[PDB]
Write an enzyme that holds these catalytic residues in place. Structure first.
Site, PDB file in Angstrom:
ATOM      1  N   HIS B  39     124.091  59.652  74.531  1.00  0.00           N
ATOM      2  CA  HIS B  39     124.522  58.244  74.387  1.00  0.00           C
ATOM      3  C   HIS B  39     126.022  58.045  74.578  1.00  0.00           C
ATOM      4  O   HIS B  39     126.504  56.920  74.875  1.00  0.00           O
ATOM      5  CB  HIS B  39     124.024  57.620  73.058  1.00  0.00           C
ATOM      6  CG  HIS B  39     124.831  57.992  71.858  1.00  0.00           C
ATOM      7  ND1 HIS B  39     124.437  58.999  70.991  1.00  0.00           N
ATOM      8  CD2 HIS B  39     125.984  57.496  71.333  1.00  0.00           C
ATOM      9  CE1 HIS B  39     125.323  59.125  70.021  1.00  0.00           C
ATOM     10  NE2 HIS B  39     126.258  58.194  70.195  1.00  0.00           N
ATOM     11  N   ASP B  90     118.663  62.934  72.503  1.00  0.00           N
ATOM     12  CA  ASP B  90     120.070  62.548  72.573  1.00  0.00           C
ATOM     13  C   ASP B  90     120.933  63.812  72.618  1.00  0.00           C
ATOM     14  O   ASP B  90     121.582  64.214  71.670  1.00  0.00           O
ATOM     15  CB  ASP B  90     120.445  61.624  71.385  1.00  0.00           C
ATOM     16  CG  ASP B  90     121.868  61.155  71.480  1.00  0.00           C
ATOM     17  OD1 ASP B  90     122.506  61.428  72.507  1.00  0.00           O
ATOM     18  OD2 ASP B  90     122.350  60.491  70.528  1.00  0.00           O
ATOM     19  N   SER B 187     130.371  60.755  67.381  1.00  0.00           N
ATOM     20  CA  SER B 187     129.163  61.100  68.141  1.00  0.00           C
ATOM     21  C   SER B 187     129.391  62.175  69.169  1.00  0.00           C
ATOM     22  O   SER B 187     130.459  62.188  69.806  1.00  0.00           O
ATOM     23  CB  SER B 187     128.624  59.877  68.866  1.00  0.00           C
ATOM     24  OG  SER B 187     128.056  58.942  67.970  1.00  0.00           O
TER      25      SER B 187
END
Lengths: 154, 236, 153, 237
Positions: B39, B90, B187
């Site tokens: 992502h 992911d 992230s």
């Protein structure tokens, strides 16, 4: 119609099958002992033949035999070497030991650790008794930080 | 990182700084791969260079060290950019055009080889250059988080009427009473566990998603379940 | 305070995602067009980042993009090469054609013609078919140049 | 070579001169292999032997001046029997040069045969060599041109002489008891060379192996075709 007896200019030169007499159309070969190479001027030779000519003269002047030189050992990406032998001497029977930059890199293995020993051989190139001419390989080590947040101690 | 501390040079030598659609992280594998979150490359909203920096804890000094050009990208086939509450798969992999030279401040992290790395209560670290509770971070930070009970994570989402995908290829860390969490800009960094049997550091997870940042459960791509895929992509 | 707008020095330098303003902690990356490389002094660079420091100055001076040079082509045992392109020029888009010392050796094969090697964007000599690996010339057997009998038109 | 003529430069560019236990011949294959007869290295009857090997000229004196070519390795075919006096089965060997030779107009290898028509009755071939002449030694390469002979007739001839020599399917015979032309001492290890009529490529179909005396008989040659796989397997690099 005879030729002069062959003439050794050093202890490292060998005359294969020396003859008592040498005559027109006859010949001799010169080689060297294990580790040494034929030289004429400042040039390396693979072989040497001298033919006895019809006037009594050898067609070619005896060469010399001098020690082989394996050259500078090849670079080891992410490692180095040190001499076990006289520093910077790359001649026959010279010995180096390759190592990797530890703890960040580790030498690839298998046999085992008389590890990265390369000696300058009779054939005039750097060789390891197991791996041969091919040089070692230094591989990334994972998960071993030098300044870790926790670590084990005794 | 919220409620954490400044990392010291060398604490997390695999840590990577990305700036693709914003700030993110990654972890070095080997000497020319970077593991991160899909992502980070393909965000949910968005509807963009691959700027990658390595080898320091200070962001300004990371940038002075210089960008590392990316030759190839591998996103996992199961990631679905356009659904919005589904972070399945992911995980992604960046290959560097040139391998990096390893040193005290730059070393890769290992991959996990068994399921005990996801045991209830196992403590791991998450480092990141993400946002703090009340300020921007200019230096790597980290927190230490416990692996969480997936049943309770489910219970917590059930409690909020959330239909987010929480698969067997994810795990959860942290606890709703803990201030410590990943946040915006974190992230794609790893959840890192020091194997107690081995003293080696392992990337058991990848910071992936949550509901806001502090005082909840955080969700991580379960790295163990993609190790075969990582190694295949790493072997072209 | 703000940093000066970035400053290209030649036609082959690219500034990725050029910003209208640049402030403290910002940065820009410089790359080159296909077949050119970053240069600073007499040194080639893999990448370039400039970082806008707290005093309004870039921490580092803009490099240049110079044409890539593939070097001297690798020698071909029992062969050679000729330039289809300017004699001696080993730069991007240069072209050589390897050939063997015929009729005594013959180029190993298998899509002709291709002993052809162009100097590509990666700054290494490559053949469409073969890649970086150079050709191989092999002995030719049974074709004496002064034979005792031979067929004749 | 008896009843022959002097070779000219470039005629037999594969021809090799050896002096191991005495004069002998061979043929260049590729740019670093020499084919010859095993009895040249391990003689039947019987001083200790150097691998002396000269290439690239027709005059023995010039060949020597060009220099010896060191041999890195020797392969003798497994079927050869040094100790058996009348059995030249598998009389074939292979020498590997420590360094490959540069090719040119005076030095080029010979091809190997790929089919049995190289052994047809009456096909003419060439044997070049540095061996002995009818009345004197040869100081230059010479050659003769000989017909492949009927092996039934070769058998008839050995039998008329009461000889029990092994004459196998891995050998063939050339020349004729009426013909003066033959190989002699020093020619062994050279090839019997056939110019393929359909192709103009020169091919080593045999290796000078044995006979009874020299002129005016049938000579016997190792059927190269039957060892081509074994040769290729030793050259496999």
């Amino acid at each position: 119609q005879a030729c002069p007896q062959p003439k050794t200019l050093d202890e490292f030169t060998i005359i294969q099958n020396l003859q008592p007499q040498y005559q027109f159309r006859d010949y001799f070969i010169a080689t060297c002992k294990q580790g040494y190479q034929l030289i004429e001027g400042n040039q390396v030779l693979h072989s040497f033949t001298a033919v006895c000519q019809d006037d009594g003269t050898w067609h070619r002047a005896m060469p010399r035999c001098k020690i082989k030189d394996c050259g500078q050992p090849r670079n080891l990406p992410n490692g180095d070497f040190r001499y076990t032998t006289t520093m910077g001497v790359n001649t026959y029977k010279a010995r180096i030991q390759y190592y990797c930059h530890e703890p960040y890199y580790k030498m690839q293995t298998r046999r085992e650790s008389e590890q990265g020993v390369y000696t300058c051989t009779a054939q005039g190139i750097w060789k390891n008794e197991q791996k041969g001419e091919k040089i070692p390989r230094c591989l990334p080590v994972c998960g071993k930080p030098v300044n870790p947040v926790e670590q084990r101690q005794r | 990182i919220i409620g954490g501390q400044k990392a010291k040079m060398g604490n997390f030598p695999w840590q990577v700084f990305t700036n693709i659609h914003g700030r993110g992280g990654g972890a070095l594998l080997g000497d020319r791969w970077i593991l991160t979150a899909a992502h980070t490359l393909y965000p949910k909203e968005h509807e963009a260079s691959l700027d990658v920096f390595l080898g320091h804890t200070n962001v300004e000094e990371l940038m002075k060290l210089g960008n590392h050009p990316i030759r190839r990208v591998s996103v996992h086939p199961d990631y679905r950019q356009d659904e919005s509450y589904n972070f399945e798969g992911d995980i992604a992999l960046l290959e560097l055009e040139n391998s990096v030279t390893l040193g005290p401040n730059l070393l890769p992290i290992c991959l996990p080889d068994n399921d005990t790395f996801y045991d209830l209560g196992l403590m791991g670290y998450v480092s990141g250059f993400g946002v703090m509770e009340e300020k921007i971070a200019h230096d790597l930070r980290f927190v230490r988080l416990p692996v969480a009970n997936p049943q309770a994570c489910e219970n917590w989402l059930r409690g909020k009427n959330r239909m987010d995908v929480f698969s067997q290829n994810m795990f959860c860390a942290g606890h709703p009473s803990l201030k410590q969490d990943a946040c915006q800009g974190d992230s794609g960094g790893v959840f890192a566990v020091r194997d107690p049997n081995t003293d080696r550091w392992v990337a058991t997870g990848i910071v992936s998603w949550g509901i806001g940042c502090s005082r909840g459960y955080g969700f991580y791509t379960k790295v163990l379940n993609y190790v075969d895929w990582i190694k295949k992509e790493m072997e072209e």
